[PDB]
Amino acid sequence: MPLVYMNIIMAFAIALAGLLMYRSHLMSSLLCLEGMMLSLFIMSTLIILNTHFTLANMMPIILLVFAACEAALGLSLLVMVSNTYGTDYVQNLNLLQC
Amino acid sequence: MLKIIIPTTMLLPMTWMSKHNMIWINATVHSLLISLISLSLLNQLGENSLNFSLTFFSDSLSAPLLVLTTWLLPLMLMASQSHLSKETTTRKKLYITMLILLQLFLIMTFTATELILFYILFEATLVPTLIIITRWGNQTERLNAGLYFLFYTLAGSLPLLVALVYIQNTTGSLNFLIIHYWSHPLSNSWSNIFMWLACIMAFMVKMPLYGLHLWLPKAHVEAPIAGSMVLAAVLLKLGGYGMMRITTILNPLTNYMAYPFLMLSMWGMIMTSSICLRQTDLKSLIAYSSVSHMALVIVAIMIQTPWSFMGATALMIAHGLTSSMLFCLANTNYERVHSRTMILARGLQTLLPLMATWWLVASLTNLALPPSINLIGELFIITASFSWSNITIILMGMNMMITALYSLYMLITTQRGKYTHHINNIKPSFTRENALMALHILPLLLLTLNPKMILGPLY
Amino acid sequence: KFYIREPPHGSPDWLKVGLTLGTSVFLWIYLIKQHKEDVLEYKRRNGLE
Amino acid sequence: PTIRLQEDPDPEDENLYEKNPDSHGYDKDPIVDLWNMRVVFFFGFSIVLVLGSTFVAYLPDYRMQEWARREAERLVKYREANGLPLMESNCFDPNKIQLPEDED
Amino acid sequence: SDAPPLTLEAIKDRVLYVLKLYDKIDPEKLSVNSHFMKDLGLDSLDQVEIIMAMEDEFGFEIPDIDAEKLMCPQEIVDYIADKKDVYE
Amino acid sequence: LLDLIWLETILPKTTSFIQMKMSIMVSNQKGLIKLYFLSFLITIMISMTLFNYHE
Amino acid sequence: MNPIIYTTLIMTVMSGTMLVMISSHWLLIWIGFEMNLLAMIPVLMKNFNPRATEAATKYFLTQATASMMLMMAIIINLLYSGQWTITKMFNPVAMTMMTMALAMKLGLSPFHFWVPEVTQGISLQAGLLLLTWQKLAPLSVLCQISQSINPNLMLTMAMLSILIGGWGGLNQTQLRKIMAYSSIAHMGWMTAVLPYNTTMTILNLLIYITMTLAMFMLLIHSSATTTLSLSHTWNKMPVITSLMMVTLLSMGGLPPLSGFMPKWMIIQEMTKNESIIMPTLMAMTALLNLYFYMRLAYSSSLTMFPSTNNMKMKWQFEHTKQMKLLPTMIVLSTLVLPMTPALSSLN
Amino acid sequence: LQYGPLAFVLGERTTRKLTETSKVITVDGNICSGKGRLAREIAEKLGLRHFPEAGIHYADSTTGDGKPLDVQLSGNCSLEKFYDDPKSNDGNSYRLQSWLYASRLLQYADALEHLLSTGQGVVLERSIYSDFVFLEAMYRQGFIRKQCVEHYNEVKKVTACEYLPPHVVVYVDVPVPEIQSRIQKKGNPHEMKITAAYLQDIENAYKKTFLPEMSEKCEVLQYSAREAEDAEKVVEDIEYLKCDKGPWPDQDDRTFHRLRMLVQNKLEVLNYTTIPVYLPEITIGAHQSDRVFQKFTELPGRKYSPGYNEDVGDKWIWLK
Amino acid sequence: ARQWQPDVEWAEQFGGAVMYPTKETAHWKPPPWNDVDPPKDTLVSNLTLNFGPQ
Ligand SMILES: CCCCCCCCCCCCCCCCCC(=O)OC[C@H](COP(=O)([O-])OCC(O)COP(=O)([O-])OC[C@@H](COC(=O)CCCCCCCCCCCCCCCCC)OC(=O)CCCCCCCCCCCCCCCCC)OC(=O)CCCCCCCCCCCCCCCCC
Ligand SMILES: CCCCCCCCCCCCCCCCC[C@@H](O)O[C@H](CO[C@H](O)CCCCCCCCCCCCCCC)COP(=O)(O)OCC[N+](C)(C)C
Ligand SMILES: CCCCCCCCCCCCCCCCC[C@@H](O)O[C@H](CO[C@H](O)CCCCCCCCCCCCCCC)COP(=O)(O)OCC[N+](C)(C)C
Ligand SMILES: CCCCCCCCCCCC(=O)SCCNC(=O)CCNC(=O)[C@H](O)C(C)(C)COP(=O)(O)O
Ligand SMILES: Nc1ncnc2c1ncn2[C@@H]1O[C@H](COP(=O)(O)OP(=O)(O)O)[C@@H](O)[C@H]1O
């Protein structure tokens, strides 16, 4: 693999670690989710362009579309959480235990 | 052998379609008729079994057990209708349904030709018994007893299932006839040792073996009278029947794998006989008596000789009848005085003479007086053990003394002495209880008259 | 007797009852016809008769 | 209320002899009681017990005990008449048994 | 688990510590039975400030009445114990 | 000594005690996504290093 | 929520599941998962309250993380082999990531923490949907890629799931959490036999779905979410409690009930390979699930708990809404063992 | 067809049936005031359905035959013995109060269901929003414990929040001495023992809690003793009310759908009345519960579902 | 004289948030009877702005 591929994999891993380690804000985790999506888009585009897979050129676009849905979904949920607590802190989501 | 299985499945809707005040009469009459029908299985051959079909067969070892089960159902019905008088009709029908389902499962268990089918039925017997114990028991310990009755069984039986399927992936068949004919010796390896343990531990915990018996006092004390009857007289013999069946594939490992269990059986027989000497509960005394007798049966099965197998079969039949009689005799006094303490109601021979005669006969049979079948089984087992090793006559002899002591102890505690002054609610014995005692005791001496019917296939 | 309407009246709902019996009889006759044709096809393929 | 819950009192036990001096201990209704006693006694003692014991006592000899005794009598007579031993230590003819060739 | 079961001795220790942190009370002359106005020479406003300091320390609000009659540390301890239902 | 104490102590009471302790250990979680998402990260790394590296 | 909107959302959930089940393209399977999550999020919040919002947020975070790992595994597989078809998963790292993502979606241990919380935070109908219908798609993918699984990782997660399900369910008085822990243990059982036989996985899933549907419909019929509120049902309708007790016994795996058939079969299958120790440990551990089922049966059916006075009023009314599939579900949950060989129709 | 999501999908909408006379009305007042007569006259003049005040046996009047059952099988409480021994040690007082709240909740559900199904207005005597005053009167006099008040508050909080408050609240003011005079002149020998403190507590609770908090939702029409007999003037006062401030105008079709599914299926209405809080006054032992339930199931028309009891003349059972 | 049945003391073992209470979980509370927590008074402050004089 070239160095660009491993750089994109490193970006994906960094975004995954950022999501998995919450600080306080849900918005930062949502941004990490969008970063994962961006890294996936870039890597899929690079692989498709490198091998001249013509019919797969539409695949990244579809990816972006569903990313938007997830983003919208997340933002919607954030709104409701804020309306319950006046803050988007993840420590307020503790009503349910194991 | 569907001529016996189908009438029980017909007892089910007949009970559920009966008029509200005629359930007991119909159930008892048709259960007695089914016992009369099942009496025909005693006509056995001398070489092989009665192979009715690909699924069911009857042998000289299982026919007396089937007769005992079908005879015990009506006795449970008579013993149960006293304390269930205030119950609603639907719950009475449910209780009778549990009893009928237990009888059906036991009948199918004692005749299954297949070991996995035997496992399925021998495990299905738990649900009606557990429901009976935890629903119609009297005190709050019953719930715990049910748990003790359940997991103690399952922890022993779940490994067996694994072993069973393992065997079927090696020999290709679990049918008992093919297993017997295609038998091969077991080598001496760790895998074979653990396979032996998996095949043995379920039946050893259902006996129960000494050290694994803690569930039995709870189960036999907190259960209703019918539950105690069926637990002591039939459900303990599942372990013996299963061990007699499964030991055909465990040779020659048993030759040295029986030492810990033989030691436990003998020393714990002495220990439980001694425990019977200091017991404030009358039901617990009978339970520990059952433990001692089943320890003797374990020794007989483990030493693997024809005389031992004959004595073991006779001892299982005799113990079933005797322990059921003892439980019913104790339940009469309990229903009179609502307490299980042995030294509460004393001097009952003065107040109930015929009941005292029943007590005397039951206690004389419990201590194996000649020529009762109890003595025949005990003496055959003792002779086999003496052939196994001359020193056993010590321990066995010890037990023979201790049993007698505690047996007469119970009698002398309950029937002799002076009556308790403040207990004035001891009514004359009902015809139902006397008939129950007579129907328990007459078959015992009738079988004494013809002892080869309960001596098993090795006869 | 009932103070309320009790939508299930003394007469049963005849449409539902008729539909139930019709479906049951149709299923039974369909099963019999299917079994007959299966038997005939099996005999024809194996040439018993 | 100084109480913990609303509950019925524990009722006293009913004596079946009060309303039926000859009560048989089967049921509170005298007729059903009497017929329960009658069916129990007839089908337990008369039918199952005595007739079953008679049936068992006269079961045909499917264990072949008498046949075995007669066969043993025949064999003993023959072997004593012709001087052969009464029994042989081998239950199988050695001619049909093939031992391994080498024991070393 | 939550905070330990606060007792009378800890209450008295905290009350005395807060009182000796007040810059206008000498630590040595202050005792658990010293009257604020007579022994310590404080008028109404210092008593108000002391009550507010107790408010800060124990995290609960004492109205104008109730607090108007806490005249020495022992009464403050008794009031705090009674409000918190502490018997030991 | 034997029937009521030690035979009870070894087989059933020990089993019940162990099961109760493990149940309390397992089910007592605060319900904070931070903690068990950190545990998810640890699990993912352990899975890539233990099982995935050995193929 | 509007009934038309609710029907559209439910149909979109089922359409996402079907798209996962009928596709040969990894992108289409991923799209099915995305659509299923998008339509499922509002269904969990049909009854609006803070607990439902928390459950929806936790579920969304978990499933979005799992889907991102899924897409990354797909992209790695494409990089090392230009294939889009769902097949033997030509790369091992991609297969490890795929297994982790699908386990997170199913709730297998140690990615199990979200299941009890989400089940407790939502209504009984939403919990029914989540614990029955939401297991089909990841299990279908796992069945399709079963030949390339790493048995060590899958079996470790299955054993952990069984152990954690039993231990966690041992400590619950809330019925929804009990159901969630039972679900975790049953997913462990389903995934333990997956590397050896997918037909056994399908059989176990079908029997578990039938039993769970019967249990949840019985819990909806008698409006109980806690043990104590369920202990009142005997004084209102005892038939429901009796059927519930028999269903609990079946769920405990006792013969001759049909809940015994899956484990039995799985054990036999695992004994056709060598695999002796693992089934023995698995049955030993399932005894815990049986224990707390028995405790529920004690609390609700085999003993009578005290009731309240206002219950008398409830005696005068009948159940208005009637579930048409409850009797068939109960009968299939209990009296099905004699029809065991019909499992041949599954393969 | 039974109302449900299917009827809402095609056709049925609640908003169209409302024709300016929906107007849930309650006529509150202290003990022995003429609120009932005013309620009947208002219902007659406006053409609304009048609901008599829910008693101990209200639920009996709507199920099976309308005749009441035995007190042992229904209610298990007495108003007469509450008057005789309000401080009894068997928990009669709070048992009666809880049963009365349950009955009032059922009646409110019935009234809302009728209004939302037919569009016709209803007139109630008291409501779930007014019952609490009696509870308060029981607490100040020492007739019930504080735990009973806590349990009542829990049940009311989980139940009464799901419905809509009445459009217009009519209250009738009668001073306590006049109430005592009316009670003395009545003749019922159990109400002579009502002390003036009890009635004063009821009036205090009314005027200090119910009217202020109810006035925030909608305006309240108060009438003295003399100006309640003229029902025509009261009705003409009701008619010219500007009702645009409560939750009622803020109700759309889907909220009405939810409420209409709630008001039917009375089991869901009564769900939280039997919460597993074990007060000695309302907790019943297993043996007594079993005996009483067996007694109840043996009533002539109670063993089976309404249309399946052949002992009260149900025919064609084997085809239903 | 009659079968034992659970009483209030027996029933109260199953009314907590968890079985086998410990020191940490002794302060967990059971969920509300309906799944509705009471709304917190999380007041949001509006923006205060000076409009004029400049
Ligand atoms: C009230 C009870 C209270 C409750 C108590 C509990 C009761 C529970 C009961 C439960 C149910 C039990 C059912 C069991 C069924 C068992 C039936 C059975 O298998 O029968 C077998 C057996 C019949 O054998 P078999 O295999 O059928 O016959 C084969 C041959 O082909 C036949 O040979 P054969 O060709 O020579 O013909 C002989 C034939 C005819 O032979 C003769 O007539 C000749 C007899 C000799 C007399 C010759 C001289 C006398 C007359 C001379 C003067 C007149 C002639 C000239 C006229 C001018 C006058 C000078 O006589 C017979 O067939 C024997 C009688 C049949 C009895 C069957 C028993 C059925 C019992 C079932 C009912 C159970 C309830 C009891 C009710 C029974 C009634 C109370 O019956 C016996 O008991 C035989 C015993 C008699 C032998 C003598 C005794 C020897 C004693 C030696 C031992 C001494 C030691 C001390 C022990 C003392 C103890 C006695
Ligand atoms: C409370 C009551 C419950 C019921 C009790 C059931 C009793 C079960 C006991 C099992 C019987 C024997 C088990 C194994 C057979 C031999 C035991 C061993 O001591 O013998 C020697 C074994 O040697 C050493 O002892 C090695 C084993 C040592 C490790 C075993 C652990 C023992 C600790 C005891 C713990 C208590 C167990 C019960 C727990 C409840 C023989 O030497 P070796 O020839 O090499 O082994 C024979 C097998 N070969 C041929 C394949 C080689
Ligand atoms: C109340 C007061 C009582 C005292 C007074 C009583 C008066 C006298 C009555 C007592 C009789 C004394 C007994 C003397 C022995 C005579 C009977 C004996 O001879 O019969 C035996 C026969 O006994 C029977 O075989 C035994 C009866 C079978 C027992 C079955 C019990 C009924 C089933 C009920 C359910 C079982 C439950 C237990 C499970 C196994 C012979 O055996 P056998 O050597 O062959 O016969 C050879 C000749 N044959 C073959 C041609 C017949
Ligand atoms: C940042 C800096 C901002 C500064 C702003 C300051 C604002 C000033 C506002 C002042 C308002 C008043 O004058 S308020 C008017 C205050 N005057 C009176 O009360 C007259 C009677 N005097 C007394 O009662 C005692 O001398 C008393 C002093 C109370 C002591 O109380 P005690 O002995 O019983 O403890
Ligand atoms: N919630 C309640 N608690 C206790 N008693 C009540 C309650 N509601 C009504 N009552 C009793 O019902 C009786 C009649 O009710 P009321 O409406 O005041 O008189 P009337 O029927 O003449 O209008 C009164 O004795 C009153 O005390």
A78 C-beta neighbours (distance < 10 Å), count: 17
Q: How far apart are CA B58 and CA H306, in angstroms?
A: 53
Cis peptide before B371 (omega within 30 of 0): yes
Nearest ligand, measured from the Cα of B39: 3
Our answer on whether E and F touch (3+ beta-carbon pairs < 8 Å) is no
Cis preceding-peptide flag for I53 (omega within 30 of 0): yes
- Would you call I8 and H283 a contact, using CB atoms and an 8 Å cutoff? yes
Compute the distance between CA of residue G55 and CA of residue G121 in angstroms, rounded to an integer: 5
End-to-end CA gap in chain A: 43
Looking at G232-347, list the stretches that DSSP marks H as alpha helix, in order from N- to C-terminal side. Answer: 238-251, 260-272, 277-297, 311-314, 326-334
Q: Is the CB of B41 under 6 A from ligand 2?
A: no
**H183 close to ligand 5 (CB < 6 Angstrom):** no
Tokens of E17: 């510590």
Amino acid present at G239? V
Measured from the alpha carbon of residue B152, the closest ligand is 2
H318: DSSP letter = G
DSSP B20: T
Q: How many residues does chain C have?
A: 49
Choose the CATH number for A3-92 among 1.20.1560.10, 2.40.10.230, 1.10.287.3510, 2.102.10.10: 1.10.287.3510
Per DSSP, helices labelled H in B83-140 are 89-111, 115-124, 126-136
CA angle C13, C14, C17 (to 5 degrees): 90
C-beta atoms of I19 and G170 within 8 A: yes
Residue E20 CB: number of other CB atoms within 10 A?
Answer: 13
User: Which of chain H's residues have a Cβ under 8 Å away from the Cβ of G319?
Assistant: 267
**Closest-CA residue to H48 (of H233, H235, H192):** H235
Residue of G nearest to A36 (CA): G68
Residues 6+ apart with CB under 8 A from B353: none
Q: Could you tell me the resolution of this structure in angstroms?
A: 2.7
Which chain D residues are closer than 8 Å to I1 by Cβ?
10-13
Name every chain I residue with its beta carbon within 8 A of the beta carbon of F20: 20
For residue B457, give both structure tokens: 């296939």
Measured from the CB, is residue E49 less than 6 Å from ligand 4? no
Element (DSSP H or E) covering residue G308: strand G307-308
- The rounded distance, in Å, linking the Cα atoms of G340 and H10 is 45
Judge: H99–G309 Cβ closer than 8 Å, yes or no: yes
Asked whether the beta carbons of residue F38 and residue A20 sit closer than 8 angstroms, the reply is: yes
8 Å CB contact between G62 and G115: no
Q: What are phi and psi of H172, to 5 degrees?
A: -115, 125
**Mutation for testing the D interface, residue in H144, H278, H282, H288 having most D CBs under 10 Å:** H288
Tell me which residue has its CA closest to atom 14 in ligand 2: B193
AA identity, residue B420: T
Does B120 sit within 8 Å of G291, measured CB to CB? no
What tokens were used for G26?
């990894």
**Which of helix, strand or coil describes residue H7?**
helix
Residue A53: which of G69, G82, G113 has the nearest Cβ?
G82
**Tokens 């549907």, residue located:** G213
Domain edges within chain A: 3-92
Instruction: Provide the residue count of chain B.
Output: 459
Measured between alpha carbons, how far is D2 from B361 in angstroms, rounded to an integer? 53
For residue E44 and ligand 4, the question of a CB distance below 6 A is answered with yes
Breaks in chain E (C to N over 2.5 Å), named by the residue before each, are none
Q: Is any ligand 1 atom within 6 A of the Cβ of residue D59? A: no
Is H83 annotated to bind a ligand? Reply is yes
Other Cβ atoms within 10 Å of B45 Cβ, number: 13
Tell me the two tokens of residue H242. 């500007």
Q: What are phi and psi of A6, to 5 degrees?
A: -70, -30
What 3-state DSSP class applies to H89? coil
Spatial strand order in the sheet of H122-124: H49-51, H122-124, H25-29, H168-172, H220-223
CB H21 within 8 A of CB H167: no
Taking contacts as CB-CB distances below 8 angstroms, the residues of chain H near C11 are 316
Spatial distance between the Cα atoms of B115 and B101, rounded to a whole number of angstroms:
20
Beta bridge mates, H284: D6, G307
CA distances from G251 to B119, E58, G229, G330 (A): 19, 54, 21, 11
Q: What are residue B112's DSSP bridge partners? A: B56
Query: Helix, strand, coil proportions of chain E in percent (round to 5)?
Result: 50, 0, 50
Which E residues, 1 through 60, put their C-beta within 8 Å of a C-beta on chain I?
1-2
Distance E31 CA to ligand 4 centre (A): 29
Chains A and F touch (3+ CB pairs under 8 A): yes
Q: Is H53 annotated as a binding residue?
A: yes
**Ligand 3 pocket check for B443: Cβ under 6 Å:** yes
Distance from C-alpha of A16 to C-alpha of A14, rounded to nearest angstrom: 5
Cβ(B12)–Cβ(B94) below 8 Å: no
Half-sphere exposure at residue G311, Cβ-oriented, CA atoms within 13 angstroms? 27
Q: Do I1 and D11 touch (CB under 8 A)?
A: yes
Task: Give the integer Cα–Cα distance in Å for A83 and G278.
Answer: 49
In the block, residue with structure tokens 């989400």: G118
**C-beta of residue B309 within 8 angstroms of C-beta of residue B245:** no
H36 a known binding residue? yes
- How many CB atoms neighbour CB H35 within 10 A? 23
Residue C38 host element (H or E): helix C14-46
E66 an active-site residue? no
Dihedral angle computed from the Cα positions of residues B91, B92, B96 and B98, in that order, rounded to the nearest 10 degrees: 20
- Domain E8-84 indexed as CATH 1.10.1200.10: yes
Q: Which of E26, E43, E56, E85 is catalytic?
A: E43
Characterize the bridge pairing of strands H122-124 and H49-51. Answer: parallel
A79: which residues sit within 8 A by CB, 6+ positions away? Answer: none
Ligand 1 pocket test: pick from B441, B442, B444 the residue with the most ligand atoms within 8 Å of its Cβ: B442
List Cα–Cα distances, G34 to G28, G57, G77, in angstroms.
Answer: 10, 15, 20
Q: By C-alpha distance, which of G59, G139, G63 is closest to G105?
A: G63
What's the distance, CA G92 to chain centroid? 28
